[PDB]
């Protein structure tokens, strides 16, 4: 009533004050500033490998940290570990539930994590004395499906779920240590900072939030999209990120200045982005649209400089190695592809 | 080739065995019939499972050397469009509606009742873009309570524009035609209907017939003869 009205009014005043103080710090767009350097030449990328063996739609993939091994997950119910240089298969892991949406691969190479549409995140151990891959742990405690999961180190994992909640877990105990709350709708994606002390998340209320792993508090809020947020990623510097909407638009948000930097869209694109990624020097922004092909934007001038057209269904996942050698794309036709 | 050493000619063999096991395990998942079950809460879903019993919930049974597998999504209550494209290649959708409950109104809101909310849900799931060629089996549940409930209250509370004598068969026909009308394709979709009840034992034959029909038409479509 009275207290509710006063709280709502003061919150609106603070929102207006935040918007004004964000408006005051802008003098020149990044476009005016970058009107000097010459454009990169048209990027001619061609397919080198093609990795086949999945019998259904592919939903996620993740590059290893030695830049030679990757993992992929499909609705078939299997999780496969490949070997890009020779195309061979190292491991094929059966699953107890085939409704997967997320896979992640440890930054040391011992564990993999999987999950989706079951409310449960599973941790598998790859290096055992018995010769097989066995399920190591089963983290339960969410209420909606699992949208993303990332390893923070070998014994700490952060997940995001479709009940407006992210959680940080100790794997050995099995229990949440911190819960991250404050969004309105389903949380769709998260990305970790290069130092792994911050991470951003993006949800279906057209907003993105900058958290804090230590203290478990939301520190900043970024808005401006007009629809869902399907993908997000940090700049290799760790001081900006790029958001991939569902209204056929990408955006670049700045951390220290907390303001929108530029917009990546074109008048022939009317279908939403399903994945974004960066280049090792932070110049090329790769975006995977669902008109069946990827697009390569020059991140300092917002100009297309190539097209990776080799798929015949929706592109669902996309990623660049840690040394910037190749890019991999997956798709709903059950094929992975690798580009130099 | 000859570029390979004695420890790169064993990784290739291991990969080939992985491949044959994957391909052999993809055959056992192509000779099962997958059904997606849907309903409006207190609408006989559990009872239908009981006649057919052996987050996501699973049922897995057998009938006449055919093997059915049934997915129940009641306890999700998330945003629907972010996971409804997962059930894209299901053979059929089993929709359970309760016609013995037309009078009672929503617990959340005394204004709107069971029937119109269920009709809206059916409309949403029928004209979806992922299910433009997936069939819908429609179970009308609890036909005992309808018999004893129709005598007191005329259905003009739920259907003001209907002219009837408030008897069983004409009201049941009116309900089924009102449900089958919401279909907007009429060409690449059919909506079967069956009046169920507690103590039936006959609610597996109907599903078997409907899925045999769907499979026959899929086969005709594949060879182009259709």
């Amino acid at each position, epitope marked *: 009533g009275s207290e509710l009205d006063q709280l709502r009014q003061e919150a609106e005043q603070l929102k207006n004050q935040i918007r004004d103080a964000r408006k005051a710090c802008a003098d020149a767009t990044l476009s005016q500033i970058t009107n000097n350097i010459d454009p990169v030449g048209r990027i001619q990328m061609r397919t080198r490998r093609t990795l086949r063996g999945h019998l259904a739609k592919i939903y996620a993939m993740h590059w290893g940290t030695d830049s030679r091994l990757l993992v992929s997950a499909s609705q078939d119910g299997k999780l496969i570990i490949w070997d890009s240089y020779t195309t061979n298969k190292v*491991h094929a892991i059966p699953l107890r539930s085939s409704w997967v949406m997320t896979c992640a691969y440890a930054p040391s190479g011992n564990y993999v994590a999987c999950g989706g549409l079951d409310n449960i995140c599973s941790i598998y151990n790859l290096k055992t004395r*018995e*010769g*097989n891959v066995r399920v190591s742990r089963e983290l339960a405690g969410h209420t909606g499906y699992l949208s993303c999961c990332r390893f923070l180190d070998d014994n700490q994992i952060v997940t995001s779920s479709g009940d407006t909640t992210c959680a940080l877990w100790d794997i050995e105990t099995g229990q949440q240590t911190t819960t991250f709350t404050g969004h309105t709708g389903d949380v769709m994606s998260l990305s970790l900072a290069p130092d792994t002390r911050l991470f951003v998340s993006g949800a279906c209320d057209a907003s993105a939030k900058l958290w804090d792993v230590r203290e478990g508090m939301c520190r900043q809020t970024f808005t401006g999209h007009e629809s869902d947020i399907n993908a997000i990623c940090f700049f290799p510097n760790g001081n900006a990120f790029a958001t991939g909407s569902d209204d056929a638009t990408c955006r670049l948000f700045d951390l220290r200045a907390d303001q929108e930097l530029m917009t990546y869209s074109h008048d022939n694109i009317i279908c939403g982005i399903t994945s974004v990624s960066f280049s090792k020097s932070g110049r090329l922004l790769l975006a995977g649209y669902d008109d069946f092909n990827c697009n390569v934007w020059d991140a300092l001038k917002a100009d297309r400089a190539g097209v990776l057209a080799g798929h015949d269904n929706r592109v669902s996942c996309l990623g660049v190695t840690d040394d910037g050698m190749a890019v991999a794309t997956g798709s709903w036709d059950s094929f992975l592809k690798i580009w130099n | 080739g000859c570029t390979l050493s*004695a420890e790169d000619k*064993a*990784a290739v063999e*291991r990969s080939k*065995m992985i491949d044959r096991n994957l391909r052999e395990d993809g055959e056992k998942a192509a000779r099962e019939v997958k059904l997606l079950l849907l309903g409006a809460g207190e609408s006989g879903k559990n009872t239908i499972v009981k006649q057919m019993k052996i987050g996501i919930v699973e049922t897995h049974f057998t009938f006449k050397d055919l093997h059915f597998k049934m997915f129940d999504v009641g306890a999700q209550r998330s945003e629907r469009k972010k996971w409804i494209h997962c059930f894209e290649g299901v053979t059929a959708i089993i929709f359970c509606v309760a016609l013995s409950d037309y009078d009672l109104v929503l617990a959340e809101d005394e204004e709107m009742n069971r029937m119109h909310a269920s009709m809206k849900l059916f409309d949403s799931i029928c004209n979806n873009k992922w299910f433009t060629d997936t069939s819908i089996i429609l179970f009308l549940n609890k036909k005992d309570l309808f018999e004893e409930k129709i005598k007191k209250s005329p259905l003009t509370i739920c259907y003001p524009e209907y002219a009837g004598s408030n008897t069983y068969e004409e009201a049941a026909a009116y309900i089924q035609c009102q449900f089958e009308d919401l279909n907007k394709r009429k060409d690449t979709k059919e909506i079967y209907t069956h009046f169920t009840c507690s103590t039936d034992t006959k609610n597996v034959q109907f599903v078997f017939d409907a899925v045999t029909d769907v499979i026959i038409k899929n086969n005709l479509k594949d060879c182009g003869l259709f």
Partner: single-chain antibody
Amino acid sequence: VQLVESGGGLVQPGGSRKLSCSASGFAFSSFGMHWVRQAPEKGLEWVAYISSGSGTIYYADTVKGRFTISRDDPKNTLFLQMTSLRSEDTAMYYCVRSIYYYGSSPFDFWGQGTTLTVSSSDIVMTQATSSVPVTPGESVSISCRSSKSLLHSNGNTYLYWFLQRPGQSPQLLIYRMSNLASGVPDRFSGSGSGTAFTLTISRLEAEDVGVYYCMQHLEYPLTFGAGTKLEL
């Protein structure tokens, strides 16, 4: 994890016999398996190999046409059948696990051994020294040399160092050139180039006393360097 084989005994020069190993503890159906022999007061040499899935079988030129290797995969028991027993076939037989994929470590676990007495080209690896007296606390270096290059085009060089203590079966120490085996102290290190290789022990204790072997894995047959002992 364990491998227990049996079948040994004393047999006449004209005869045939069988050896069988029982494999309890691991996934026996995804592990290639070797048989390796060691003569009485002499080094040890490779005998046979059977793949995972019984696809490929390799033998030794000295033994081809007399030995048959087979599995029993449901029951986890692997057999070697010997049809002619010359008087120089007396040895002690070991059965060896090995798994190949990217990042593996073949020759991990090394059975327990079964004696057998009998009544009465190839890459050459050489170890120059035969005995190295030493005292605890000081480093030791052991040398292996080959007759041609082990550095393949792909980038790997297939050299293995492993140890045998008295009254005990051997165990992997180092794989490839510098990779350290599972559960060994970090005191051991190894390196080399081309056709020369050296193993170094920085510290020293009373458990390092024993014999050391260097082996190659470019092509079958697999050959073993002679035995070098290290005394206290």
